[PDB]
RNA sequence: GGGCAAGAACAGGUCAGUGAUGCCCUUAGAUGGUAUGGGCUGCACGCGCACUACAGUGGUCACAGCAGAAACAAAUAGAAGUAAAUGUGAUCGAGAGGGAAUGAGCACUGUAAUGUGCACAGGAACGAGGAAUUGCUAGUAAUCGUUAUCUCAUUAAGAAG
RNA sequence: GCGAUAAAUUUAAAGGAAAUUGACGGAAGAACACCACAAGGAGUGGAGUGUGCGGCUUAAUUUGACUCAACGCGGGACAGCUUACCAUACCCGAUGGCCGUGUGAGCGUAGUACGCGAUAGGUCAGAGAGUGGUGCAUGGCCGUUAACGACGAGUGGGGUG
Ligand SMILES: [K+]
Ligand SMILES: [K+]
Ligand SMILES: [K+]
Ligand SMILES: [Mg+2]
Ligand SMILES: [Mg+2]
């Protein structure tokens with residue numbers, strides 16, 4: 284997918300910090316909150332959707348990504364956070 | 375595209391004194407950090423992070 | 433004066449509007465993207481729809497003057513913009529009507545002229561149209577301009593007002 | 594010419610009978626309408642140009658649509674983009690199994706010894722993508738019948754239907 288290891292962990296932490304992501308299709312521009320190329324962010328999240336970790340809904344020109352509960356844990360193992368840590372959407 | 379030859383375990387970059395102290399055998403780049411070493415072939419000395427080739431006057 | 437507008441139909445049109453879609457096909461030497469160019473605008477020829485005409489109920493010069501309403505740096509020949517038919521006086525006198533093909537120029541838009549504007553030359557057919565054929569009953573037809581409407585970097589002889 | 598009267602062969606029904614609903618009539622009777630006419634008015638068809646269509650040419654001149662209801666139509670006024678077509682060049686690949694890998698998978702290079710490192714290796718399954726095909730596999734939306742007077746439900750009546 285052609286992302287650096289730094290860029291990969293930047294997406295992992297964002298997607299855990301906030302339980303959602305929003306990406307614009309057919310764009311060579313940079314994602315406002317990450318400073319990563321839009322097509323590359325789409326391609327990264329694509330894998331998480333295929334793995335069944337993330338829902339995808341496509342509306343007009345935007346892809347809305349939602350992290351499932353049964354995948355918060357997988358991303359918590361992957362990102363090696365403490366067992367007490369949860370997203371802003373989870374009390 | 376072409377095939378990539380491989381040189382196994384890279385240890386040739388260094389030399390070891392009788393005291394066990396180690397020093398680089400190839401010379402080192404001034405502008406890419408001293409941790410980047412410089413190749414040799416004929417009139418050419420060359421570098422990695424910059425692809426710059428020096429041409430010797432010999 | 434518009435707008436909304438039965439039931440039933442049609443193997444009527446669109447997979448080239450669609451993260452609407454079944455099935456077949458291709459898929460790193462791609463039928464996927466991108467970039468630089470060329471074409472879509474080629475020319476013996478037959479057709480459909482529009483635009484200027486064939487003059488005197490005209491052409492040319494100047495002067496006025498009126499819309500739907502309200503937006504307009506500057507510019508010394510000239511190089512987008514707030515009507516035009518029209519009203520008065522002059523002029524021209526029966527191809528001084530008409531502006532097609534073309535020359536060396538002078539500018540503008542643009543990443544790039546091949547596109548557009550301007551000045552000078554040049555001056556083709558056409559002298560009211562065979563067989564046929566299309567709308568239109570009143571502020572209608574026909575005439576005359578105009579779009580802070582749509583296309584639009586620049587381009588209307590197109591639509592929609 | 595008449596009277597009287599066979600076979601071989603062929604075939605699933607027969608312009609067989611009466612009635613019913615439609616479609617049609619160079620049948621009758623009512624209505625209606627300048628996409629009909631009468632009474633009129635302006636044109637189109639002829640000329641030059643703008644634009645679309647066929648034919649032929651080309652490396653490519655990408656393509657749909659054909660009586661009304663194809664042909665300034667696809668919001669189709671194409672220098673790039675649009676753009677599907679032609680010439681050259683460059684770039685890429687969900688996941689899962691197996692195997693192989695930091696003693697270095699693969700990548701960059703003035704390509705061989707230097708720089709970067711799991712990211713992007715091979716093979717089987719399986720995804721996804723495509724202005725690629727089929728509107729005679731569809732949905733949606735349009736146009737046309739038609740802007741026409743018709744249109745079905747419940748209860749009663751008649752007929753074997
Ligand atoms: K005519
Ligand atoms: K049309
Ligand atoms: K349909
Ligand atoms: Mg059909
Ligand atoms: Mg064309």
Ligand SMILES: [Mg+2]
Pocket residue numbers: none
């Ligand atoms: Mg004249």
Ligand SMILES: [Mg+2]
Pocket residue numbers: 590665
């Ligand atoms: Mg048009």
Ligand SMILES: [Mg+2]
Pocket residue numbers: none
């Ligand atoms: Mg007899």
Ligand SMILES: [Mg+2]
Pocket residue numbers: none
């Ligand atoms: Mg008549």
Ligand SMILES: [Mg+2]
Pocket residue numbers: none
């Ligand atoms: Mg004509």
Ligand SMILES: [Mg+2]
Pocket residue numbers: none
């Ligand atoms: Mg009709």
Ligand SMILES: [Mg+2]
Pocket residue numbers: none
């Ligand atoms: Mg191109």
Ligand SMILES: [Mg+2]
Pocket residue numbers: none
């Ligand atoms: Mg394309």
Ligand SMILES: [Mg+2]
Pocket residue numbers: none
């Ligand atoms: Mg498609």
Ligand SMILES: [Mg+2]
Pocket residue numbers: 444728
């Ligand atoms: Mg059909």
Ligand SMILES: [Zn+2]
Pocket residue numbers: 403404405406410421422423424425426
């Ligand atoms: Zn260097």
